[PDB]
Structure 1
């Protein structure tokens, strides 16, 4: 499913991401825009053989099982495919684990390079939230 900007912002808020570990909704919407252009089915293969999945492009080396990333963990206890669902619940729950990991949203390279320090509130402007 390709979310609308405000549609995703509402979904993320409903699932408790707004100010989760101190990160305002704009930050999560911005991260999703640049990770996946709001497409739950987005996937990208990494040089190391791992693959990133979903709206927030969560990686199979640590966080989900895809059956093809040798000697990886599955800290979110999910198949990576769950991260491609029109229902963002598994992506949200796994993202909460990741942002809790110690580097906050710096876990998402695109967040650090494209969102951090910017006016991220822009990403929820005009939304009924």
Structure 2
């Protein structure tokens, strides 16, 4: 499913993402926007290293979920990468919380550095009641 902006913001808030390890809801929103356009079903294959990015946060198979076909990979979220393509994003949010428990936090995603870091991200949550 492709979330509407404010619908997603409220969905993430209910799931405990607001301020999780220091990360505001607007930063999570900016991440989802630029990674996937708020799209849970998106996959993107990285020909360079044979990994794939999954779902609304485009979480990578090399480190975070198992898809069986990424060489040398581990599965730190202990999930099939299939779980990251559901309309319900509970598992994707649990896995995003796992990513940012590591030292880099939200810097783990390069698109966040490019598109969100050091920017005014208030617009992503404007009017959403969050």
What is the TM-score normalised by the length of structure 2? 0.97
The Cα shift of 1:128 comes to: 2.0
Match of 1:68 in 2: 69
Aligned length: 129
The Cα shift of 1:17 comes to: 0.5
Which runs of 5 or more structure 2 residues have no equivalent in the other structure?
A: none
User: Deviation string for 1:12-41 (max 9, x for gaps)?
Assistant: 111111001111100000000000000001
The Cα shift of 1:119 comes to: 1.0
In 2, Cα distance between the equivalents of 1:45 and 1:120? 28
Determine if the alignment matches structure 1 residue 36 to structure 2 residue 36: yes
Which runs of 5 or more structure 1 residues have no equivalent in the other structure?
A: none
Match of 2:17 in 1: 17
The Cα shift of 1:121 comes to: 1.7
In 1, Cα distance between the equivalents of 2:82 and 2:61? 10
In 2, Cα distance between the equivalents of 1:78 and 1:112? 26
